[PDB]
Design a protein around this nucleic acid. Structure first.
Lengths: 82, 104, 95, 96, 81, 97, 102, 93
DNA sequence: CCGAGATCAGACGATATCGGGCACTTTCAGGGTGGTATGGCCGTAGGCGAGCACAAGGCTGACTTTTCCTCCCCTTGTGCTGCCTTCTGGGGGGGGCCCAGCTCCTCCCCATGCCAGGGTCTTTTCCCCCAGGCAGGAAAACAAG
DNA sequence: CTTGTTTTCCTGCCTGGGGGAAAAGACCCTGGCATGGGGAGGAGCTGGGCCCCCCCCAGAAGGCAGCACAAGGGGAGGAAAAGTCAGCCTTGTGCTCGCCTACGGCCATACCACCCTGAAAGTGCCCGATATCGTCTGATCTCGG
């Protein structure tokens, strides 16, 4: 819960996402690039969500905080409030 | 009678008045501000619900779901443009296969 | 009997475009999310709806990125996507 | 104790659903998404009209600002039909 | 008032391409870019004209243009704010 | 004496990237803008600052498009930008989906 | 005045009235205009330091839109912040691809 | 006859404090005015939405702190909240 | 690696249009008083989030095989670039004028603050109807022959 | 192209679980009263954008030689894809603690409304001086042999 958690979006999972994305053939160097891309995106969103939470004088990262964080980055998320 | 009943809108004109007032959108808010805006919201919701119910019927399902909602959104060209940077939760993706990656 | 290389890839594509489920596993995704949030603020708590929202945003973003990278790879007269395609896609869209 | 009651657009969404297609149900998440949709478009058009009025220096937001905000925020066909329906509704509100 | 699009000549599009770092140019790039500029100008002119009609003005102003381009993400500095 | 094909192109690239003038013709750009606004509204007026604003924005837009289409051309084992490069750049940027 | 008391150069009163009359919220605090004026002052000084440095590097004593655009597009953080602004009369940064380089 | 208010008198003075040697052209000065009339509109509006989310109706300096922390990159934030808080403390003390 | 050829850069005479300074006004921040109302602090319950066993079976990691793709090299031919010359319109000037934009005064019509009371909006129960599981059957591609 | 081989959609049957209807609270919607303030309309000015005429010269246009790069073809190799086997950990179930968010109550102090006042910015005009045009050289890159 503290280290080496990026190796949890396994090669079968990235393959699932890519096959949903229409890719037929996948190079063996694609997985370690998609992992990094997801890590940077999650940093980008969770930073704003945690900032909203700490401003609200709270301790629990809430669905509304996450939705606000996505909304700021032009990533409006439907279904979890708003 | 009530403003919603007056214009036939199914939408809370008075509640929209409250939201406009307390939203700090203007110091003064006109009386057409909520009728017109409730009409816009109602029409857009009616269109998206129509296309979503059509998408639901296309899968022989009588319960509209995020799948059908996003199918309507990403199949109608104009609504995808309106909601381009909008992510639907648990809706799938549009089924596309490029011509190059197909059996010969 | 063995299938010709590629037809199961197309079957996977069709099966995985017909479904609306979630593809990354919930427990490792949640562990990764908590690890990432640890840096921003030590000892936080995370609502289940919030972490599910993060998953349903991240996976959709990855799907869009993969579609655009596939477009790049096809433009390069290929069928196989590559880190070069991924990098070009991001550098063009502005990420 | 009593908890602060929440508020939503669900009753009106149900009415419009039963008006357009009175035979197909809707899920809890398919309700949350529609609530997010209606409130997000509400905020978008309200902000557009607010900036329009503040630029024009008109202290009250009116049907003019709402119509022009719709014309500026919705793509062609949606903007046209939204403007038409809003106009026909404001006519009835003015009359009735 | 007909086909002013051809006023954007091949030399001008080559000027812009050389600004953009293009070393070699095909023969259809010019017409493709003409179509692209026509579409973009249509969008921005639509937004600015709608602003002007809301103001009920008869002139299109730099501030209207800046607002119209800001609403499309192409925020324009130097000419008001 | 003649120059090799490409050495004039690179010099034109450098001479223009070091400069800042408006690379399109002003009078027929303004005429194009008027023709475009004609359909939206009849007998429109145009502030000179407004039309200069539109040109100064459109030039930057096209220069960005031409450094993205260039990257597509380099991607596709080439040095010549192509219409297909323009289309790919615009699809991936999100102008036509 | 408040600007003299706090050492701020940008008009604390003017930003306070802009916040109050712009219809942002019902009430505006007293640390709000101090904070906002300090933020704008620091950010515009940050732009000006780089713009003046760029002008000096070209032996020119007059800041121009080209100089400010160069400063924006060259500084990494300022490029991210002003990522989608089309500075009039700015051009673009000299940059040529290596494959086209001989 | 009408008068227009701008940020020019202040922008020129902060220039003469940071780089006291060179001046500004008219177009560059308009660029700066548009820039400081753009970041202002970003921060005030987004702090307003923070206050709306927290169910308040008052833009306290904490809203502006969070607004800078959200609309600026990392080091820009570290170097902007510092000035904001320093000025706030100086204002009373 | 050799010399011609075209191109880019600096710099001093000079210049004018533009940046900086001075004096007024004219609007607008600021001080003082009064007042409230939105917000800060203390109390309390409660509902949901963190930590925890227990499988088990679907899912992941890993090794083989082959097979179809990727990548480098050859060649051509064909549209692309470089140079020269015609001529054409962009650009600079000069002036006119005409309608359209900004100001100001009036006062009125619609927007604003408050009263009370009910009618629509909100939370809780329940069940049955539509989503879901699943084993067997027929249709469908698939690929080696 | 026949035929064997996996995969997939269909369907009948039963189950389960949560959405659509009913029950009562609750909280602020609509009508009505008193009000004051911003904008609609109508002079007034005036100012700049449309329009034309004229001259020049630099840039577009067209062609011609020639050339080098886009594209098709060939071939080797190598790394994904499909298949199978072992093990492992995701998760669905059921459970306990606790603590953090929120609702309520009290008050409190700091920001809103309102009057004077003087003081800093907007305006216009004038002075000097700095980036720029021209042309002479100097430095530099390019190309054929």
């Amino acid at each position: 819960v503290l280290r080496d958690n990026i190796q949890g979006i396994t090669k079968p999972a990235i393959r699932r996402l890519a096959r949903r994305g229409g890719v037929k053939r996948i190079s063996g160097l694609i997985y370690e690039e998609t992992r990094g891309v997801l890590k940077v995106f999650l940093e980008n969103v969770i930073r704003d969500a945690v900032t909203y939470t700490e401003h609200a004088k709270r301790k629990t990262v809430t669905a509304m905080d996450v939705v606000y964080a996505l909304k700021r980055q032009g990533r409006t998320l439907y279904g979890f409030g708003g | 009678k009530s403003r919603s009943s007056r214009a036939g809108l199914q939408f809370p004109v008075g509640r929209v008045h409250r939201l406009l007032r307390k939203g700090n959108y203007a110091e003064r808010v006109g009386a057409g501000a909520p009728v017109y805006m409730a009409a816009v919201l109602e029409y857009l919701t009616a269109e998206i619900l129509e296309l979503a119910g059509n998408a639901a019927r296309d899968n022989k399902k009588t319960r509209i779901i995020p799948r059908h909602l996003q199918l309507a959104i990403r199949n109608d060209e104009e609504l995808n443009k309106l909601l381009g940077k909008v992510t639907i939760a648990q809706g799938g993706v549009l089924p596309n296969i490029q011509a190059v990656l197909l059996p010969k | 009997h063995r299938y010709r290389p590629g037809t199961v890839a197309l079957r996977e594509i069709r099966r995985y475009q017909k479904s609306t489920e979630l593809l990354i596993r919930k427990l490792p995704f949640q562990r990764l999310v908590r690890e990432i949030a640890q840096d921003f603020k030590t000892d936080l708590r995370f609502q289940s709806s919030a972490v599910m929202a993060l998953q349903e945003a991240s996976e959709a973003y990855l799907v869009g990125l993969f579609e655009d990278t596939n477009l790049c790879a096809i433009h390069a007269k290929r069928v196989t996507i590559m880190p070069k395609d991924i990098q070009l896609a991001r550098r063009i869209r502005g990420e | 104790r009593k908890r602060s009651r929440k508020e939503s657009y669900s009753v009106y969404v149900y009415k419009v659903l039963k008006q357009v297609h009175p035979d197909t149900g809707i899920s809890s998440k398919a309700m949350g998404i529609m609530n997010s949709f209606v409130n997000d478009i509400f905020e978008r058009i309200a902000g557009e009209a607010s900036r329009l009025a503040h630029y024009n220096k008109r202290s009250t937001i009116t049907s003019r600002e709402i119509q022009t905000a719709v014309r500026l925020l919705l793509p062609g066909e949606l903007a046209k039909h939204a403007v038409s329906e809003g106009t026909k509704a404001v006519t009835k509100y003015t009359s009735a």
